[PDB]
Amino acid sequence: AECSVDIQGNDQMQFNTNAITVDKSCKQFTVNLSHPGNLPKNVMGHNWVLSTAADMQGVVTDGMASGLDKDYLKPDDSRVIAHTKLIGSGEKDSVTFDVSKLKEGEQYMFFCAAAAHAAAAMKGTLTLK
Numbered sequence: 001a002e003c004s005v006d007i008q009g010n011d012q013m014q015f016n017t018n019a020i021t022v023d024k025s026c027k028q029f030t031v032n033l034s035h036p037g038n039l040p041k042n043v044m045g046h047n048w049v050l051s052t053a054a055d056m057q058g059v060v061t062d063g064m065a066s067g068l069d070k071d072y073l074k075p076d077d078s079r080v081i082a083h084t085k086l087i088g089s090g091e092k093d094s095v096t097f098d099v100s101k102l103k104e105g106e107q108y109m110f111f112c113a114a115a116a117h118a119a120a121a122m123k124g125t126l127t128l129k
């Protein structure tokens, strides 16, 4: 069982992967976010957020309005399944979530919720496989 994933966010506003597989024997799953490159958090902060595919838009829209000091997410947003904090370069964060939070016949999206980042394709698929 592969129950973690190491994902990178760079200075060019991209993740180094577009698709996560969550093995369904996993009781928990861990995302290790890191930020290579040379740019601070207020310039090019990244976070990793999980929601259903349907919820992504609203989570992003409400998140952008909440701002950088709220880590670009609406506080307590119930559409947020799991999330990291906002990180700048040279920084890192992990999240671990329960796999029982995912369901068959739902589609899941991961993304960064920093202003306009997900619109520029900092996002990808999350699949129970």
Ligand SMILES: [Cu+]
Binding pocket: 009, 013, 044, 045, 046, 047, 112, 113, 114, 117, 122
């Ligand atoms: Cu980002």
